[PDB]
Amino acid sequence: LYLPIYATPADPKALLSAAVATSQGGGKLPESFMSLWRFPHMLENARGM
Amino acid sequence: LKRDKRALEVERTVSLAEVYAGLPKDNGPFSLAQEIDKLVSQGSGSAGS
DSSP: OOOOOOOOOOOOOOOOOOOOOOOOOOOOOOOOOOOSSOHHHHHHHHHHO | OOSOOOOOOOOOOOOHHHHHHHSOGGGOOOOTHHHHHHHTTOTTOOOOO
C-alpha cells in the first residue's frame, strides 16, 4: 500500500583544474674582459652579436 | 679576441755578407765578393756548407 519515495540525482560537480607557475633563478654577469678595440668598434661588434 | 694581444713589432737588418763571413771555420767562412765573381765564371762550383 505504501508508495516509496524516489530520489533524484543532483547536478554533476564542476570539474576543476589546477594551474601552477614555475620560478627560475636569475643569472649573474660573467667576468668582464678588457678588449683591444676602441668603443665604436667593440660596440658595432657587440650590437651585431 | 680573448687570446689576441698586441705583439711587439720588431725589425732586424740581416747582412748576408757578414753572416757568410761569420759562420764557423769548419763550415768555411767566405765573403761573397770572392765567390760571386767566380761562381758566375763557372756554375759547376759550390761554396759554403
